[PDB]
């Protein structure tokens, strides 16, 4: 900040900063005296503080992101050091770890010296809203897949681990609109890979729902693959819908096709309940059970004949040849 | 240009007024109507950003931000970036004032989420009984593509309050699942008398068959709970009468 | 250029490259319809865009690729070819209707998505038999039951 500074002298009667217009330069007072002046709601100006030694004003505007709380006019010849707001933002972005101390110490001052700049309202909500709105707009950027813009936003003082407020990870946002390279180097930022949302949808569960192969590959590449508390439920629903892309896609990540359902219903049992011959044995080729006794306690062959197909039992026996050899 | 960017950042509402006048003069004179595609893209992106703002506000609540956004003219019918309507989001987080403001604002009371949830489902899962009542008095229904298997999974979970919320919202508790399965069968097999009683309070279907070719009477008698079989037999006789 | 933008999954790229005036029915040396290329490479956006512009999926064969996809059971590809409205009642290398192939497979969901678009359940094959006969030949009678469920209206006409 020092290497970018300028001094200036103001004669009495001048106004350095008006409350109406936004600040563009904040001035550090090093000599002279000057007076702080909020436009009083009574129709006048009153008086707040007489800032003579080693004091600055205009910063509280750069933190609160609002208009100047006080118009500030001079009192006598004052030696003021002036810094523009643009370079302050451009150093806060690179020195953001040193930048936290700025808001921290400014608020602890506002607590200790309330007569300085506390005469307004709360600011912590405003900084939280800045962070939250940046999160929402980086969500929009991930939906847009702007690699340069997303990188600039993230390196401009953004925490990559902050997802959608419900929990949709930035992987969700890049995958929903079909972005592969966006997904990869956004997930290389250190954001968690198992960020299940408000709903409990996995980043890979979201990927299998929204239909993108690239995210399917990438998330397995990073790790923390598709995990869920239910495997046969969504599997049986997809088998009922007969979405072959979705069926191979859930099976692509290796989710258990031998698991259970709302009852003890294996996905192979559901496949036998449907009737076809191609998808039906794609689950047992991954390790599904053809002798998994159901909630009743009957093998899937019994339900296969119950539904109205013996062809099905023949396929189940083709799979069961090895088991019967073991049996 | 950068200075004007900062000024519109601090005067976003006046920026909205600027774009409004830009649209009006585009339709008025032959200067802005040239290459209006990018202008349409810009107004769409701006309205998407305002949709994000209003959805986040409703996520925290902020009735005062609700009046601020109705002053700003942001689209209330539009959902959030993710695909969740403002009413779905207001159902997910307990806020009755936000829900009634959304109803008064013309926001679609019945709509599907990005993954396909109705707002009543969000209220049920988040325990918003008041939002459930407001949705019912407005008339919204689930209209879920897999209402049957969702009901069956709720029965398997055993949560009585979840299914009572579903019944209060108006779903047929015995709705057939994907494999023409009635949740009464699995309910009787589990043996919990509470859910069988709940399943028959709104009208059970013991006559309805299942993927096993069975009846809820058979499942209840297999479980062995005498009161369960008695209640299911009473409901079966009631069905046989009509 | 539609092929090249669709193969790598580009929607906005495809749209304004096609608004440049490039032909929309640009079959290649292989004769691959751009919309055929889109259905082969699996992108929904190009599917929508090409129909928006016009000159939709056209081919000299409809039941051949339909029967091959039914054999592969690629439900996304099956709905995708049917998305553009290509004839599911067409023929094959022989007089093999895609509904005949669906009866030759056995299932009940994909099978009647072709007759819901207008496929023929009385289309006599090269032998000269209705698809019901091949349905029973393959080893399923409930396939004939589905075909009769579709054929109720025809029998009312018959």
Curated annotation (Swiss-Prot), chain B:
Induction: Up-regulated under drought, salt stress and cold conditions. Induced by abscisic acid (ABA) treatment in roots and shoots but not in guard cells.
ANK repeat segments: 47-78, 82-111, 115-144, 146-175, 179-208, 212-241
Domain of life: Eukaryota
Entry GO CC: monoatomic ion channel complex; nucleus
Assigned keywords, A-Z: ANK repeat, Ion channel, Ion transport, Membrane, Potassium, Potassium channel, Potassium transport, Repeat, Transmembrane, Transmembrane helix, Transport, Voltage-gated channel
Tissue specificity comment: Expressed in guard cell-containing tissues, in root epidermal cells and in root hairs. Detected in vascular cells of the root and shoot.
Localization (cell): Membrane
GO annotation terms (biological process): monoatomic ion transport; response to abscisic acid; response to calcium ion; response to cold; response to jasmonic acid; response to water deprivation
A GO molecular function held by the record: monoatomic ion transmembrane transporter activity
Role description: Major selective outward-rectifying potassium channel of the guard cell membrane. Involved in regulation of stomatal movements according to the water status. Assuming opened or closed conformations in response to the voltage difference across the membrane, the channel is activated by depolarization. Conductance of the channel is modulated in a potassium-dependent fashion. May interact with the cytoskeleton or with regulatory proteins.
Domain characteristics, as noted in the entry: The segment S4 is probably the voltage-sensor and is characterized by a series of positively charged amino acids. The pore-forming region H5 is enclosed by the transmembrane segments S5 and S6 in the Shaker-type (1P/6TM) and contains the GYGD signature motif which seems to be involved in potassium selectivity. The KHA domain (rich in hydrophobic and acidic residues) present in the C-terminal part is likely to be important for tetramerization.
Quaternary structure note: The potassium channel is probably composed of a homo- or heterotetrameric complex of pore-forming subunits.
Family to which this protein belongs: Belongs to the potassium channel family. Plant (TC 1.A.1.4) subfamily.
The name this protein goes by in its record: Potassium channel GORK
Organism: Arabidopsis thaliana (Mouse-ear cress)
The organism's taxonomic lineage, starting at the top: Eukaryota, Viridiplantae, Streptophyta, Embryophyta, Tracheophyta
Shown stretch of the complete protein: 482 to 723 of 820
